[PDB]
Write an enzyme that holds these catalytic residues in place. Sequence first.
Site, PDB file in Angstrom:
ATOM      1  N   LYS A  60       9.768   4.950   7.576  1.00 26.83           N
ATOM      2  CA  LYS A  60      10.463   4.457   8.033  1.00 26.83           C
ATOM      3  C   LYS A  60      12.072   4.812   7.792  1.00 26.83           C
ATOM      4  O   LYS A  60      12.326   3.586   7.008  1.00 26.83           O
ATOM      5  CB  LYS A  60       9.949   3.682   6.346  1.00 26.83           C
ATOM      6  CG  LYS A  60       8.531   3.220   6.014  1.00 26.83           C
ATOM      7  CD  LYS A  60       7.810   3.070   4.903  1.00 26.83           C
ATOM      8  CE  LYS A  60       6.622   2.813   4.479  1.00 26.83           C
ATOM      9  NZ  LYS A  60       6.113   2.576   3.457  1.00 26.83           N
TER      10      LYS A  60
ATOM     11  N   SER B 206       8.731  -2.989  -2.575  1.00 26.48           N
ATOM     12  CA  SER B 206       7.613  -3.480  -4.237  1.00 26.48           C
ATOM     13  C   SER B 206       7.926  -2.518  -5.346  1.00 26.48           C
ATOM     14  O   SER B 206       8.543  -2.998  -6.339  1.00 26.48           O
ATOM     15  CB  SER B 206       6.441  -3.399  -3.108  1.00 26.48           C
ATOM     16  OG  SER B 206       5.582  -1.382  -3.015  1.00 26.48           O
TER      17      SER B 206
ATOM     18  N   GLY C 102      10.017  -4.154   3.255  1.00 26.01           N
ATOM     19  CA  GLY C 102       9.202  -5.869   3.873  1.00 26.01           C
ATOM     20  C   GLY C 102       8.435  -5.851   5.646  1.00 26.01           C
ATOM     21  O   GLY C 102       7.803  -4.536   5.703  1.00 26.01           O
TER      22      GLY C 102
ATOM     23  N   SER D  81       2.754   1.481  -2.025  1.00 26.76           N
ATOM     24  CA  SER D  81       3.227   2.673  -1.590  1.00 26.76           C
ATOM     25  C   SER D  81       2.493   3.804  -1.424  1.00 26.76           C
ATOM     26  O   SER D  81       1.145   3.775  -2.636  1.00 26.76           O
ATOM     27  CB  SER D  81       4.877   2.873  -2.199  1.00 26.76           C
ATOM     28  OG  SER D  81       5.577   1.406  -1.751  1.00 26.76           O
TER      29      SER D  81
ATOM     30  N   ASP E 142       2.336   2.272  -8.140  1.00 28.48           N
ATOM     31  CA  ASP E 142       2.711   1.103  -6.991  1.00 28.48           C
ATOM     32  C   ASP E 142       1.639   0.958  -6.323  1.00 28.48           C
ATOM     33  O   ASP E 142       1.024   2.032  -5.554  1.00 28.48           O
ATOM     34  CB  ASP E 142       4.091   0.682  -6.319  1.00 28.48           C
ATOM     35  CG  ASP E 142       3.776  -0.263  -4.875  1.00 28.48           C
ATOM     36  OD1 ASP E 142       3.926  -1.193  -6.061  1.00 28.48           O
ATOM     37  OD2 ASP E 142       3.923  -0.031  -3.964  1.00 28.48           O
TER      38      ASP E 142
ATOM     39  N   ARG F 272       2.908   5.397   3.057  1.00 25.42           N
ATOM     40  CA  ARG F 272       1.812   3.717   3.605  1.00 25.42           C
ATOM     41  C   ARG F 272       2.238   3.185   3.741  1.00 25.42           C
ATOM     42  O   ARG F 272       3.251   2.445   3.525  1.00 25.42           O
ATOM     43  CB  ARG F 272       1.194   3.963   2.391  1.00 25.42           C
ATOM     44  CG  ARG F 272       0.709   2.399   1.756  1.00 25.42           C
ATOM     45  CD  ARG F 272       0.139   2.534   0.791  1.00 25.42           C
ATOM     46  NE  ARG F 272      -1.063   3.541   0.525  1.00 25.42           N
ATOM     47  CZ  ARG F 272      -1.981   3.685  -0.440  1.00 25.42           C
ATOM     48  NH1 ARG F 272      -1.634   2.551  -1.969  1.00 25.42           N
ATOM     49  NH2 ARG F 272      -3.180   4.216  -1.003  1.00 25.42           N
TER      50      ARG F 272
ATOM     51  N   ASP G   5       8.566   6.468   0.794  1.00 25.92           N
ATOM     52  CA  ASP G   5       6.888   6.575   0.526  1.00 25.92           C
ATOM     53  C   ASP G   5       6.587   6.615   2.860  1.00 25.92           C
ATOM     54  O   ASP G   5       7.625   6.575   3.672  1.00 25.92           O
ATOM     55  CB  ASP G   5       6.592   5.097   0.641  1.00 25.92           C
ATOM     56  CG  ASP G   5       6.962   3.982   0.925  1.00 25.92           C
ATOM     57  OD1 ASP G   5       5.765   3.037   0.615  1.00 25.92           O
ATOM     58  OD2 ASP G   5       7.091   3.883   2.090  1.00 25.92           O
TER      59      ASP G   5
ATOM     60  N   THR H  31       6.503  -0.269  -0.094  1.00 23.12           N
ATOM     61  CA  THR H  31       7.484   0.325   0.166  1.00 23.12           C
ATOM     62  C   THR H  31       8.413   0.450  -0.751  1.00 23.12           C
ATOM     63  O   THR H  31       7.765  -0.673  -1.310  1.00 23.12           O
ATOM     64  CB  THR H  31       7.875  -0.412   2.271  1.00 23.12           C
ATOM     65  OG1 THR H  31       7.013  -1.162   2.505  1.00 23.12           O
ATOM     66  CG2 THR H  31       9.291   0.546   2.215  1.00 23.12           C
TER      67      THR H  31
END
Lengths: 219, 230, 245, 204, 229, 272, 240, 235
Positions: free
Chosen positions: A33, A129, A47, A169, A166, A19, A17, A1
Amino acid sequence: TTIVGVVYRDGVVLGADTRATEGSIVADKRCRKIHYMAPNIMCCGAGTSADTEAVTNMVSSHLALHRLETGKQSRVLEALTLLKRHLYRYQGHVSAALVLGGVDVEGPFLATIAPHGSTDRLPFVTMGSGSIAAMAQLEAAYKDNMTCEEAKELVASAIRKGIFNDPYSGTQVDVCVITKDKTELTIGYDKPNERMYPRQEVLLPPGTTPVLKEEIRQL
Amino acid sequence: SGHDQSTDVFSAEGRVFQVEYAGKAVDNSSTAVAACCKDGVVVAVEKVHTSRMLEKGSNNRIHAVDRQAGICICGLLPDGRAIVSRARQEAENSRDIFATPIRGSVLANRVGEFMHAYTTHFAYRPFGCSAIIASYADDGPQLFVSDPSGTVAGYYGVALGKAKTVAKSELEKLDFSSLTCDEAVGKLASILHEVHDKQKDKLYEVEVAWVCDKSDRKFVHVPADMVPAE
Amino acid sequence: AGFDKYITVFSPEGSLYQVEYAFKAVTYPGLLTVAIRCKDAVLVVTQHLIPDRLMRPDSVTALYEVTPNIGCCMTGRAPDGRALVQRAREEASDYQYRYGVEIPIAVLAKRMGDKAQVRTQQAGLRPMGVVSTFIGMDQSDQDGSLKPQIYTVDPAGWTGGHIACAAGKKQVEAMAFLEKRQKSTELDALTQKEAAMIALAALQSAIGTAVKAKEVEVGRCTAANPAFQRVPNSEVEEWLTAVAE
Amino acid sequence: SIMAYSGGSVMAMAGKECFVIISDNRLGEQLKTISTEVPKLHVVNDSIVYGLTGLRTDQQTFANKVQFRTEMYKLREERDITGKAFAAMITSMLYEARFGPWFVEPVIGSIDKSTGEVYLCATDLIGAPCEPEDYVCAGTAAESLHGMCEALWRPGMSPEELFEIAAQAMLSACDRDSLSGYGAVAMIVTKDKVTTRLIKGRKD
Amino acid sequence: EAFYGLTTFSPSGKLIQIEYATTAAGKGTTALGVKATDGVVIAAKKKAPSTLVDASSIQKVFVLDEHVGCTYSGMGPDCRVLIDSARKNCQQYKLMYNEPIPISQLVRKISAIYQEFTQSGGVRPFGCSLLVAGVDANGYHLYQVDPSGTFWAWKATAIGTGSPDAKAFLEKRYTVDMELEDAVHTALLTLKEGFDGQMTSENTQVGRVVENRFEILSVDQLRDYLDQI
Amino acid sequence: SHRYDSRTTTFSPEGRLYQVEYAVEAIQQAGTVIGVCTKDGVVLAGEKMVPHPLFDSESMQDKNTSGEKMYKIAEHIGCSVAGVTSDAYALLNYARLSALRHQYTFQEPMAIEDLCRILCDEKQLYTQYGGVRPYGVSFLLVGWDRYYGYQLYSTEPSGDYSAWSAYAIGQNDQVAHALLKKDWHESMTLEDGMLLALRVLGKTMDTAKIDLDRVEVAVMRKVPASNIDQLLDPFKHHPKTTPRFQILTRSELKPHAERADQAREAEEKAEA
Amino acid sequence: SYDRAITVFSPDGHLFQVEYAQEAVKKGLAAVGVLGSDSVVIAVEKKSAVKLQDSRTIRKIYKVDANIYLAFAGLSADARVLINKAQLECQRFSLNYEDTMDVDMLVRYVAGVQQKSTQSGGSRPFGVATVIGGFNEDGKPHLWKTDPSGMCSAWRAVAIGRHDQTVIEYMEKSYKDGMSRDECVHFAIKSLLEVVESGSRNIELLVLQYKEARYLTEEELQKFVVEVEKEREEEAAAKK
Amino acid sequence: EYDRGVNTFSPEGRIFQIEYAVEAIKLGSTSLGIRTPEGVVLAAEKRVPSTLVVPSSMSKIMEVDSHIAAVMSGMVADARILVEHARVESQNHRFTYNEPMSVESCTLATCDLSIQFGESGGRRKLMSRPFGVSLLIAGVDEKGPQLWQTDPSGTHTRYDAQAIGGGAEAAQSVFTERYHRNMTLEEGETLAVDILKQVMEDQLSPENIEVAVVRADDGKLHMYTPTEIKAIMSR
């Protein structure tokens, strides 16, 4: 995230994002999100998706009850206070790092809640992240009093840094823009990872999988 | 009828009869008087002994509440004891939670608030005692009075008891702008002897306390040889 | 079927007699308050008469400050009002603590009205015989300015905004004078001095004594200084001399 | 761990105006087959069907609670509980005991009777809802089912063709898993009818 | 703490406290509501106690959520309790089922508090009758709860003082295939016929639920119909 | 205060509980509902109030649970209520919760006599504690169970219940008593049972040519089992036929109404 | 919660609530239980056969435990709420001691509940008087009787319900010590029928032997009611 | 009648409820207790309602411990709960202090319950009325044979010869004489049985009444069987 928020000339711009991974495996490729809190308050979350959705829905219903009581639009400091109280009451077991952004009579407002309950009010915030790889971009490109187009380019670029660098994400960029009047939420603002090597549609002519006994029920 | 049996019943004219009956019981108690003398406060109470074997120091109505604040309860003594204990719980909290002596007006407000939570419910009866709170905090000398109704009011000179009118007519003629406690302990003490009738109660005695600068701003009982004999 | 008026029950014609007698307790102490709001400010004037001349003229009051921004006057049974303020103050802190902003004025009026309705439902509690008036200035939206507000809550809980309210002894004559004065001019266009002149003229019309400066206390909230604060006698005398003409 | 104790795997796929939900049959104790004839599917009405997975005692407890709640809903509100309301309901049920968590991982599939819209969902054990547009899968054979489906499924499949892909994916995915197998049971439900089919698998 | 009951049966079998409460709930202002194939219309009458009441702030048409409205006729302070619990029960439903609560469940929930107060200890019944209206998945609805706790699914009703004549007028001017603006017009018309003076945009307050939502009419929108009847 | 205590739960000098007698006298003015227990079904026929020209029906999907008079307690238990309307809903919700918790615990349909007892203990509880009025409502539960087949119970606003073969409560119920005990035999089918019901219903509210706006009927029988998905629990024996409580519309009562008034005119022509 | 004192002493020392409950008992249906040599029998009035009660049978002598039966007299709902408490107590006892509850302990517990009712806040006394019969695990038939006042007592031939004193003082002078199994069934009817109408379909009888309790069927009861009516009419012809 | 509450005072100072509960005692069966240097004796009349009752079920004399007996009067419905209370407290005092409780301590433990009546529950549940029973405890501890009495007041009183129940008025008359301090147990038997003979409407039969005796040297409770009472009547 990876969630980012940028305060621009008049309003705020939030991005995230899409995913969602359930334990090192991409469960859904187009999860959303950027939740909804009020006609003028949006709230990205990072999270554990459970708590991020639970606390957001809880305080989003509370704010609606409240603004039906008073009759005025709801203030972002009220949402921020409710969220931080609830989160600190549980000592961080409710692990949801939130980016809460809205527009008031006091101008835009963009704050971030750590899972422990601490809040910061900043010009730009990033959580998740890929919050270190996205912040690296905002520090390098944030100038004051940007126009809406510049804020959206900047948020898209700051997300595409977490998308590519990352593992937890990617696959899209959600960008919502909040002003004093309106709030427009574009879902597919940018889709870099395009659909390559088309499917081959393996053909299995119905019946190849043997069946023992079948009961069909008409309705 | 029955409209005057409980504290939760407004009369036809919006009066709470039970509290008027309560105040009627204070109107029949022993005399008290008090003066806020711009550098200290002096409270003086009449103690009507029903028995000549009573040790001196019994049924003292003036109770210390903090270092600097004291309460003289004119009326029913047991209920005054409850109010004194509640004021003591309120004054110890500000000395505990807030590291500061309770300001006189705040103490009077709290004592009134507590006296009034007994005149709203159907299961309690109003306190049968009026309190005289004499405090000297960092805000100057303060003299407040609380009636069984729960209403507080600050005075310069106040009179309570059975003989309340003629004993109040004495306090009109003091100055209260140049009056000093050192002479007020004589003035008020003589006022009580003048107003006290002696063909009803054969035994009576005056007990006076004060808080000013001479006593290090502490509420204490008067030195014995400072009250005129009669 | 015998009493019908000693507890909270409906009487045959559909009335709550304990809430009908609580309106006779406000008009009992003989006090009278008038609250008015001009373009930029709210004023509240009250009779503050201590007929006794041994009492501290600065101890007993009617104006209390519920929050740094919201004040109130309490007409009626003197102790009740005090207690009510405490409740209001409590509800502020909770609100101030739980949502992080200072409590609006309409929210305080609605909650203090609800608390008043609860007592008129259970048999035990006695209804508060006090007509509370909360005055303040609230944040107006879509422009940010502050707009004046006057809210009234009765023993029944009939909360309501106002342009000019009068409460207490001979409140009908005061309301009649205010209504007659309103039929000509526009109250939401007057300035503070005119508004205070109208309030003092209404109060002197309702009692007919040509009040002096030490019998009334005036509290004010202004767009300039948003806090509730009471104005000295050196200012009220300037409005008395001007009404005198 | 504790979620792979009883084995089991469920997988749902969406067609055009239909969807197929298929489950394995094995019930064991962490290695040893207790029984070989227990499906994982539960039908609540003619347009919803869900399948649980996790510990078996918690599967049964949660299925009882969900049935209690669904019958209670149809009584209070005189109507069939729709798909989205059902998924949100069990999400709240799961998040209630968040620190005493249930060890289930439900898999809901539903369709609108007249509208024709399919709706899949697959929550985590702590309530995180995850609604895709193609397919969901849960159980011990999660990764293998994901792999088979992301290769076999394509947008506009018809029922008699969707059943093929579903059966093949479940078989080939349970073949590489030691805690699933023993045939399978599939339910292909459309707007007009619901069909149950038992699928011959390895007796391994 | 007065745990005993105030309302009790009488030799004739009447909860006579409930009859007193239903009389007390019919003395307030007159409200009314009508239905049409396109939506529901609620219309109240803001009887101002004085010209110094700030008619902007007093309100008799309460929004319950994005799809439900309400209006009462009786004791206002009592109706505040029911409105405050109704909004809470409307939000708890969206919290757990993620779906706009249907009207029938909402009325069953708030008609469960009327009854809980007519049978609790130390409390008197409520004295206000509501007029719930709104939308759900199976059309438009207009219910009318009562102090005894009962509720009815009307089609055009009126409560308060002047109800027996307002409902008589509504019997005649109603039509089974009414569009929505016809309903607004007939509501305003039957209010005028019983209005003591002439109604202004700040002497009444209407709310018309249209196709997903309640949306209390503004002052200009309400005016646009007032000077057209 | 304790001086205005009505003291609902006290024994009067003659062992009679005044409040319960007043509840009974209250139910007597409510609407009459009758219920006949045949051998292949059980019928509840009651009378609902005159339809005002402006009444509407909540457009409810799947209208087989709640009518205006009869309600459903579980898949196999229907009930009818007489008395204070809004008070019956609290007990109805309680009974639904009870007949669902037993199915949560034991995974078997609760038998009528268990539920009829579990909601009469509640009605009694208020007659002995709390000091608040009793539930002034009366029931008629009908249902099917493997223990005694089609049952029919009746409830008092005092906690006592009784199993009846054909009962009636409300206005003029002493009349319907003498009329139902007059004509009821064991060998009576369902459709002949319904004929007995409406016939004695019209007689109790005095209507010749029975009307279809003022009457409500709800039949409880066994239909062939429907959702038997044996392939999803291969060790669960589903019965071949399940009971279903069903409330009658206008389209399906009118056939049974025209035969009721026809039997009326038949037994009326032979009065001379 | 509501716990106002209801049962309080009168200016003469009489618990009006308890006397009023004992009045509501007198208006109920009788119940005669007699104690034999090796079996105890209980007879109940079975209000009527109204041609409208379900043809299915429902009993009026309730099985409190596998060996302890009960027959109440008074208000029916409180009777059921007391029987349920007794059935819960028997099963809790045969869970904390592995031993079946004797009759006497059950009577003591039920009388304890009866009495606790008349000394609790906000609760009126139960309006029930019960007869509890049974066997211990060593034979020994026991027959006990409780009152709304809570005073339990063991009898040898007891009656409860309406016209209580009449039946008791009649069948006290006609009870022979150590009757046989078919004597009791005759002595139970002949005494109960002194209060019931001649209708033979309003009697419900139970015999209770060691490890066996069976209800007497309709024709079985008729065989004895005819013998009883003949003996009574013979006693009448002897009166005159 | 409920005009005055459960805790109101009469103008003469005695609480109404306890003044009425003492009146209910004279409606019950009489009872005795005689303390002597050899032991203590408790006599009582069962006063059966009919000749059919198995009389051994209405024993007016309950054993509280192997050395403590208790005879009651008034309404025997409550007295059973007072006796269970005394039994539990005595067994606790034996479990904790490992020795027989003292009789005065048992009487204290009984009155400690008998006082706990009132109406407002709040924290603790109370009795809505006093017990309409006046116990009579007797026992042998190291302080010799002792007889204590208890009223519904909660007031315990040590005696030497007392009578409760209906015919206690003339019983005290028979008491003032015919009783020295150092009698023999047989003399107490004769005197108690005579009193019972004098103040009862029924005819004194060995099955009619109940007598219990607690002897000092033995230190145990010894309830009499009908034949032993017949042996006393035959003297």
